[PDB]
Amino acid sequence: TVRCFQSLLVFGNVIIGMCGIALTAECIFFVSDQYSLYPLLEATDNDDIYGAAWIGIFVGICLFCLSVLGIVGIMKSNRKILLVYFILMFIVYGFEVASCITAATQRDFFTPNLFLKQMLERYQNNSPPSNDDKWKNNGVTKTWDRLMLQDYCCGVNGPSDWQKYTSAFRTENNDADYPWPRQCCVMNKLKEPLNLEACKLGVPGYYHNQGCYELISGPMNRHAWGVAWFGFAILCWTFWVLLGTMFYWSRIEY
Amino acid sequence: DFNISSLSGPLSPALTESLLVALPPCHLTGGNATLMVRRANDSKVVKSSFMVPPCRGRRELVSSAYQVTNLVPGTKYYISYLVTKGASTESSREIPMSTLPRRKAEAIGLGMAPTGGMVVIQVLLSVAMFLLVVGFITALALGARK
Amino acid sequence: KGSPVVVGLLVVGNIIILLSGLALFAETIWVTADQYRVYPLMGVSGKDDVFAGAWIAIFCGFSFFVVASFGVGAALCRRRSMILTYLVLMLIVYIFECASCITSYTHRDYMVSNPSLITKQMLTFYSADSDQGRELTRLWDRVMIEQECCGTSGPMDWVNFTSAFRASTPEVVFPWPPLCCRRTGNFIPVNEEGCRLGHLDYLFTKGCFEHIGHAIDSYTWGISWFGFAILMWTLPVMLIAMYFYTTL
Amino acid sequence: VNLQPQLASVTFATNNPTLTTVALEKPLCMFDSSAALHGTYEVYLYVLVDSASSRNASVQDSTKTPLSSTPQETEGGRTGPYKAAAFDLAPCSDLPSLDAVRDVSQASEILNAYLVRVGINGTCLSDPNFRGLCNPPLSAATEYRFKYVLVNISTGLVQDQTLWSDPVCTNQLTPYSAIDTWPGRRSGGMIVITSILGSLPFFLLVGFAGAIVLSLMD
Numbered sequence: 099t100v101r102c103f104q105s106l107l108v109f110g111n112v113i114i115g116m117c118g119i120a121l122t123a124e125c126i127f128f129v130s131d132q133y134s135l136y137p138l139l140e141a142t143d144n145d146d147i148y149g150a151a152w153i154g155i156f157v158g159i160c161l162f163c164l165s166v167l168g169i170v171g172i173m174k175s176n177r178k179i180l181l182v183y184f185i186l187m188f189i190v191y192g193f194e195v196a197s198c199i200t201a202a203t204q205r206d207f208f209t210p211n212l213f214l215k216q217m218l219e220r221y222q223n224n225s226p227p228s229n230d231d232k233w234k235n236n237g238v239t240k241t242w243d244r245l246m247l248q249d250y251c252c253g254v255n256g257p258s259d260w261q262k263y264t265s266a267f268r269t270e271n272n273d274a275d276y277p278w279p280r281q282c283c284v285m286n287k288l289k290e291p292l293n294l295e296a297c298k299l300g301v302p303g304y305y306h307n308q309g310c311y312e313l314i315s316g317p318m319n320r321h322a323w324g325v326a327w328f329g330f331a332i333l334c335w336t337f338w339v340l341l342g343t344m345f346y347w348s349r350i351e352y
Numbered sequence: 353d354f355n356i357s358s359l360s361g362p363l364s365p366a367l368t369e370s371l372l373v374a375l376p377p378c379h380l381t382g383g384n385a386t387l388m389v390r391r392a393n394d395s396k397v398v399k400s401s402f403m404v405p406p407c408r409g410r411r412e413l414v415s416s417a418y419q420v421t422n423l424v425p426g427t428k429y430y431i432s433y434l435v436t437k438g439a440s441t442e443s444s445r446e447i448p449m450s451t452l453p454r455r456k457a458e459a460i461g462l463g464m465a466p467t468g469g470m471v472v473i474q475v476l477l478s479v480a481m482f483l484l485v486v487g488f489i490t491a492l493a494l495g496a497r498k
Numbered sequence: 499k500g501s502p503v504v505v506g507l508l509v510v511g512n513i514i515i516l517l518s519g520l521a522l523f524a525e526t527i528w529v530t531a532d533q534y535r536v537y538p539l540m541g542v543s544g545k546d547d548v549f550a551g552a553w554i555a556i557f558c559g560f561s562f563f564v565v566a567s568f569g570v571g572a573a574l575c576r577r578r579s580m581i582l583t584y585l586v587l588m589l590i591v592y593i594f595e596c597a598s599c600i601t602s603y604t605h606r607d608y609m610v611s612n613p614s615l616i617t618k619q620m621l622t623f624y625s626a627d628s629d630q631g632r633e634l635t636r637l638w639d640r641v642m643i644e645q646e647c648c649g650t651s652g653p654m655d656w657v658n659f660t661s662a663f664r665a666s667t668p669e670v671v672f673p674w675p676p677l678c679c680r681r682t683g684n685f686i687p688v689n690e691e692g693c694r695l696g697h698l699d700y701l702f703t704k705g706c707f708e709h710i711g712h713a714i715d716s717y718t719w720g721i722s723w724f725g726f727a728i729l730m731w732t733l734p735v736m737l738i739a740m741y742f743y744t745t746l
Numbered sequence: 747v748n749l750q751p752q753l754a755s756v757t758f759a760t761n762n763p764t765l766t767t768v769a770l771e772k773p774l775c776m777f778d779s780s781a782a783l784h785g786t787y788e789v790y791l792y793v794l795v796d797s798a799s800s801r802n803a804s805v806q807d808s809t810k811t812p813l814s815s816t817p818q819e820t821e822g823g824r825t826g827p828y829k830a831a832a833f834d835l836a837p838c839s840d841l842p843s844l845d846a847v848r849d850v851s852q853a854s855e856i857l858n859a860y861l862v863r864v865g866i867n868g869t870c871l872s873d874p875n876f877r878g879l880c881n882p883p884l885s886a887a888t889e890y891r892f893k894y895v896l897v898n899i900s901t902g903l904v905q906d907q908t909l910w911s912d913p914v915c916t917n918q919l920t921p922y923s924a925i926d927t928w929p930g931r932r933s934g935g936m937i938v939i940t941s942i943l944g945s946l947p948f949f950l951l952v953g954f955a956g957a958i959v960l961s962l963m964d
């Protein structure tokens with residue numbers, strides 16, 4: 099009956115709310131800048147995954163309040179309540195449409211090319227032109243040294259890359275002593291080499307001998323599919339209760 | 353017949369085990385020097401000998417102190433020189449020095465020293481719990497009559 | 499029949515609880531995000547609370563939002579049975595938040611009233627072969643060159659006490675971690691004797707316990723005093739609410 | 747006789763021919779198949795580069811004593827070959843196990859028995875008292891040729907020699923702006939998300955409007 103209809107509505111609304119919270123939680127998880135990763139993405143204004151997530155925080159709270167609003171309205175059977183409810187959710191719908199699309203648009207560019215550009219250009223530089231260029235040239239260099247010194251990879255494809263392209267490091271450091279970053283030799287616990295001549299030659303397992311693209315892409319790739327598809331599912335759940343609610347609203351006697 | 357200096361400016365020279373010593377004066381350079389070290393409680397002298405290095409003024413870092421070690425922990429050691437350049441000779445009077453003892457990581461008795469923050473919080477909040485509980489009880493007691 | 503002058507008191511008082519409850523919900527999540535990576539540092543000594551306070555408090559803060567919104571509703575609605583359900587929801591959240599306050603603070607002094615309670619871990623687990631020796635050495639070797647410090651007493655902890663390091667590292671070669679030397683952009687040591695003998699400028703001479711203490715201290719007061727601040731507003735509102743329940 | 751030197755074996759030297767450097771196998775058994783080992787011996791490496799007049803590269807003088815030529819007087823190996831390194835004759839049975847070079851104790855002596863490196867010493871052009879065989883950084887984009895020679899140290903004559911190597915090319919550089927930082931590709935997800943989430947608003951609008959109309963009707 100109409101009661102059943104109401105039931106369906108309220109149940110979808112409940113789901114809308116629980117999505118608002120779980121979206122808020124997910125957003126906070128990525129907005130945490132969890133292993134940083136600000137430094138690789140503020141380098142190109144490649145920040146829409148985070149921008150979408152921030153949007154995800156406030157729509158997440160917003161959707162929760164609107165949900166209960168909806169229940170309250172349905173129950174109260176008040177035309178104006180429903181109306182306002184409609185408007186508000188419409189707005190919030192737009193903002194999460196925006197977040198979804200902005201994360202989704204960004205991630206296709208995360209590539210073994212992009213991260214190989216920033217590494218050849220911005221690592222170990224010592225001649226940047228301007229302040230915010232020096233502020234980017236620090237954070238990239240630091241992030242490459244975290245990954246190389248503890249997570250034991252080297253380059254984006256591998257310890258090839260430093261030996262096939264021009265780079266910031268290369269103009270500072272001659273290959274005969276610095277054939278790729280020192281951060282790529284395997285050091286013993288004295289934090290000095292197993293044997294350096296063998297790391298110069300590339301004798302296998304004296305050096306970090308794998309690219310890092312997986313480490314860089316893996317989190318970004320999760321953040322990407324994460325906010326966008328979860329927002330889309332909410333934007334469907336909301337769409338069919340919007341149609342139902344609207345219907346009911348329309349069927350209100352005066 | 354000089355007096356040794358003390359390079360405690362640039363560095364920390366006291367330690368567990370090893371300690372640092374000033375080189376002989378530039379008057380002696382190219383000379384043959386014997387450093388001698390003596391654990392205070394005993395007659396026990398030990399000799400270590402070297403040529404007096406060229407006077408690199410104040411150019412920073414080499415063994416520019418001499419370094420002395422097997423100076424087993426807690427021990428007071430005196431340090432001294434005898435040196436020669438030609439058949440002429442040179443000397444100094446002893447100076448005492450002392451090396452740190454050992455201390456156990458498991459002998460860290462918990463230095464637990466409460467702040468007033470903890471204790472003020474506990475008292476204040478236990479009082480507040482008490483007042484609310486009591487209040488709630490007394491409220492429903494009064495309401496029971498109406 | 500209950501004065502509007504007291505209705506307004508419940509309104510403003512609930513609004514204040516609502517806002518500070520939402521802000522506490524936000525703050526306590528921000529503790530659990532572990533802005534300094536100290537969740538590994540507690541868990542080797544165990545019996546933890548500095549995070550358990552926050553993991554109590556997140557739900558308590560959102561609890562304060564929901565019962566307070568309802569509380570504004572109940573005050574305007576002036577319904578006896580609604581004001582009862584304001585008391586008999588709030589006073590449970592109240593008791594849980596007391597525990598959040600007490601727990602969060604109590605462990606703080608149990609470990610950062612003196613640095614040595616933390617120092618015990620570093621002497622045990624630094625570069626030590628056992629499972630948690632590697633885990634916590636990832637925390638430390640990151641703190642070290644993220645912030646330039648050699649220990650809680652810098653390049654002297656490593657000779658002020660026995661540590662796992664001595665037994666692998668004959669001190670005549672390194673009296674302190676090799677990562678205490680300042681490293682170039684090529685990650686090489688700046689001078690050898692300049693760190694093996696140690697002038698006061700090639701060494702990271704600062705005391706590392708500042709960061710550890712300031713982290714622990716800052717996480718704590720965020721839970722503990724913001725908690726008491728909510729609770730000290732709740733008492734007069736909840737007492738006024740007794741008078742509402744007993745007047746209606 | 748195909749007495750030819752070689753680029754050091756690509757099984758275990760993954761980066762070898764860097765912008766200024768090359769590792770070579772040493773002359774293992776190479777002078778000694780007919781049992782030449784009868785006293786002390788040393789070997790010279792000479793380096794040279796392709797040019798028309800370079801066929802006058804008489805690595806020995808006419809009286810069979812080697813050229814005393816260096817990177818300066820040859821302008822990096824253009825106007826003649828230069829004496830880029832030397833070492834003693836290895837007696838063939840030593841056969842470094844390239845597998846076992848993971849014994850960190852032996853690693854350096856295995857490399858020092860197995861190979862020689864060309865390009866290594868960026869300092870040695872400068873110092874006015876380093877009166878040594880300078881092994882400077884080799885120039886980029888240059889195919890080199892290499893030649894080991896044996897010298898009878900008891901009498902001071904070249905005994906015999908290798909043929910020049912097949913041309914060895916340095917690594918050479920793409921300029922870093924050439925790396926097209928576009929993907930060309932589109933994901934899959936972007937296209938569904940853009941197309942559906944652009945569609946959805948219109949329908950909501952439609953429905954809302956319809957709601958309006960319905961409520962106005964009744």
Ligand SMILES: *[C@@H]1O[C@H](CO)[C@@H](O[C@@H]2O[C@H](CO)[C@@H](O[C@@H]3O[C@H](CO[C@H]4O[C@H](CO)[C@@H](O)[C@H](O)[C@@H]4O)[C@@H](O)[C@H](O[C@H]4O[C@H](CO)[C@@H](O)[C@H](O)[C@@H]4O)[C@@H]3O)[C@H](O)[C@H]2NC(C)=O)[C@H](O)[C@H]1NC(C)=O
Binds near residue numbers: 870
């Ligand atoms: C890369 O290029 C660099 C620079 O172009 C080369 O480095 C130099 O190598 C020379 C080799 O001749 C070094 O020469 C010095 O010779 C001194 C000779 O003096 C007397 O004393 C010795 C005993 O020590 C007697 O046998 C001799 O007959 C003389 O009476 C030595 O005393 C020097 O040793 C001291 O300096 C070195 C370098 O600091 C220390 O390692 C020693 O412990 C000692 O303190 C020295 O041998 C010259 O000093 C080097 N300079 C530099 C800048 O390193 C490399 O050889 C070259 N490498 C490669 C692989 O190509």
Ligand SMILES: *[C@@H]1O[C@H](CO)[C@@H](O[C@@H]2O[C@H](CO)[C@@H](O[C@@H]3O[C@H](CO)[C@@H](O)[C@H](O)[C@@H]3O)[C@H](O)[C@H]2NC(C)=O)[C@H](O)[C@H]1NC(C)=O
Binds near residue numbers: 385
């Ligand atoms: C400085 O010069 C002196 C004088 O040469 C060196 O002292 C000692 O000199 C004596 C006599 O020349 C040497 O004596 C012999 O020593 C051996 C052990 O080395 C001993 O078995 C013999 O019975 C005999 O006594 C002695 O070698 C030498 N060294 C010492 C420590 O006694 C001194 O070594 C020179 N110091 C430097 C820095 O060169």
Ligand SMILES: *[C@@H]1O[C@H](CO)[C@@H](O[C@@H]2O[C@H](CO)[C@@H](O)[C@H](O)[C@H]2NC(C)=O)[C@H](O)[C@H]1NC(C)=O
Binds near residue numbers: 364651
């Ligand atoms: C812990 O380390 C400090 C230095 O960081 C030690 O300080 C000593 O202080 C006295 C008095 O100021 C000096 O005479 C010593 O020279 C200092 N030691 C050094 C190495 O210079 C302190 O003794 C140590 N404490 C414990 C309990 O081990």
Ligand SMILES: *[C@@H]1O[C@H](CO)[C@@H](O[C@@H]2O[C@H](CO)[C@@H](O)[C@H](O)[C@H]2NC(C)=O)[C@H](O)[C@H]1NC(C)=O
Binds near residue numbers: 782785787899
């Ligand atoms: C280097 O070549 C010389 C010349 O053949 C060799 O030395 C001569 O050997 C003959 C035959 O045994 C002797 O009659 C001569 O007296 C030797 N010359 C001298 C100066 O002693 C020499 O054996 C060869 N050395 C090597 C290392 O191959």
Ligand SMILES: *[C@@H]1O[C@H](CO)[C@@H](O)[C@H](O)[C@H]1NC(C)=O
Binds near residue numbers: 219223226235266269
């Ligand atoms: C440093 O990076 C900037 C761009 O961020 C680049 O223009 C500059 O050429 C680099 N420095 C060197 C030494 O090439």
Ligand SMILES: *[C@@H]1O[C@H](CO)[C@@H](O)[C@H](O)[C@H]1NC(C)=O
Binds near residue numbers: 353354355
């Ligand atoms: C040693 O130091 C004392 C005190 O400063 C000084 O009086 C004396 O002249 C110095 N020289 C000698 C040989 O004692």
